[PDB]
Amino acid sequence: RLIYTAGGYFRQSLSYLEAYNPSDGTWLRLADLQVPRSGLAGCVVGGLLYAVGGRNNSPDGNTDSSALDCYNPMTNQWSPCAPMSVPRNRIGVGVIDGHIYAVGGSHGCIHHNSVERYEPERDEWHLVAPMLTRRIGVGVAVLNRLLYAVGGFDGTNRLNSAECYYPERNEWRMITAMNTIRSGAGVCVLHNCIYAAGGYDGQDQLNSVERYDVATATWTFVAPMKHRRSALGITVHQGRIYVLGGYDGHTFLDSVECYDPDTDTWSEVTRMTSGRSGVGVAVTMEPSR
Numbered sequence: 001r002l003i004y005t006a007g008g009y010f011r012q013s014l015s016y017l018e019a020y021n022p023s024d025g026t027w028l029r030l031a032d033l034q035v036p037r038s039g040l041a042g043c044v045v046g047g048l049l050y051a052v053g054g055r056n057n058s059p060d061g062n063t064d065s066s067a068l069d070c071y072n073p074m075t076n077q078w079s080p081c082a083p084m085s086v087p088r089n090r091i092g093v094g095v096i097d098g099h100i101y102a103v104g105g106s107h108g109c110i111h112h113n114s115v116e117r118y119e120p121e122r123d124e125w126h127l128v129a130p131m132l133t134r135r136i137g138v139g140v141a142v143l144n145r146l147l148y149a150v151g152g153f154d155g156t157n158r159l160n161s162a163e164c165y166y167p168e169r170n171e172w173r174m175i176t177a178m179n180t181i182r183s184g185a186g187v188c189v190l191h192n193c194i195y196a197a198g199g200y201d202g203q204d205q206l207n208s209v210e211r212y213d214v215a216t217a218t219w220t221f222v223a224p225m226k227h228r229r230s231a232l233g234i235t236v237h238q239g240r241i242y243v244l245g246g247y248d249g250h251t252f253l254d255s256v257e258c259y260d261p262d263t264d265t266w267s268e269v270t271r272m273t274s275g276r277s278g279v280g281v282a283v284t285m286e287p288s289r
Contacts, residue, residue: 002028002286003237005244006051006071008276009038010252013056017071017078018273019286020256022237027273030287031076037065039231041093041140042280043100045120048072051280053084053091053105064089064107068100068118068125073287082123084116090184090231090278092140094147096167101128103149104135111136111155115165129170132163137231139187141194143214148175150196153183158202162212178219179210186234186243190261195222197243197259200230205248209259223264227255233281242269247277 002019013036019028033051040054049071055064064087070079088105095101100118102125104111111134116127135152142148147165149172152158160181163174178196185199185206194212196219198205205228210221229246232253236242241259245252252275257266 001237001283003235003242003281003283004042004049004071005233005272006042006049006280007033007037007040007054008245008279009057010274010276012036013038013054013058014276020270021286022269025270027270028287031071031078034069034078034080035065035067037067038278039090040065040278040280041091042282043093043095044282044284045095045098045100047284048120049282049284050081050100052093052100052102053088054278054280055089063087073285076287081118082125084125085127086112086114088112090137092135092138092149092187094140094142096142096145096147101140101147101165103140103147104131104138104152106136109155111153129165129172132172132174133159133161135159137183137199139182139185139196139199141187141189143189143192143194148187148194150187150194151178151182151185151199158183158200176212176217176219179221180206180208182206184230184232186232188234188236188241190236190239190241195241197234197241198225198229198232198246204228205230223259223266225257225266226268227253227257229253231277233279235281235283237283242281244281245272245276245279251275252277
């Protein structure tokens with residue numbers, strides 16, 4: 001299995017799809033996205049890689065994206081899916097029971113609290129209950145079939161609050177807030193905790209990392225990253241957290257750091273082929289040829 005990074009930004013919505021092999025160190029260059037996109041999210045259902053939402057920043061035009069696109073490592077081909085009801089730049093997504101939940105994001109000046117659910121078997125999106133909070137640059141994670149939306153930016157204030165979606169009750173409920181305000185953090189689930197890494201508090205890009213334990217309903221700090229970064233990509237591969245790229249207030253990083261929970265240590269493991277922020281990241285099987 002490989003770590004796929006789709007899109008991103010380095011002053012232009014990129015269309016790179018590259019996949020990292022944590023054993024042999026290689027970056028594989030795969031089929032380009034059909035449309036350059038930054039601020040998207042990635043996820044995997046079945047064995048398929050999905051690129052959700054984002055924004056096409058081009059020298060000739062700037063447009064947020066409602067698009068859902070599907071990448072098949074067996075064919076090294078992208079195929080489009082039905083799109084979301086609205087464009088969602090700086091989106092968060094999570095997967096519950098083979099369904100993709102799209103959360104928040106922005107469309108021009110609209111900052112969404114709305115949420116919608118994709119079913120791959122019917123190629124259909126349906127709106128569900130909206131969040132209590134409008135959130136762009138929101139981190140999303142799924143723990144025990146509950147959907148968590150963490151931090152973000154409501155258009156005026158950046159947020160440390162977090163809330164939890166109950167699919168079968170179709171309702172959102174606020175949980176304990178994070179220690180730190182973060183928009184554009186990397187949020188994932190590792191073991192049985194929700195990690196929130198980096199992001200932007202409105203003053204500084206952050207290297208701090210904290211983790212939510214559902215049992216103690218408490219957010220605890222762990223080892224911080226080596227590099228402060230906002231709009232980083234994040235995923236879990238083989239018991240460890242990988243953070244990719246991001247923005248540190250001066251440069252678009254190519255640094256990839258890896259968190260080992262057993263030692264509570266971060267290490268730099270690779271560089272991307274070029275620095276970028278706002279990527280979609282997820283893990284699936286390596287391609288064929």
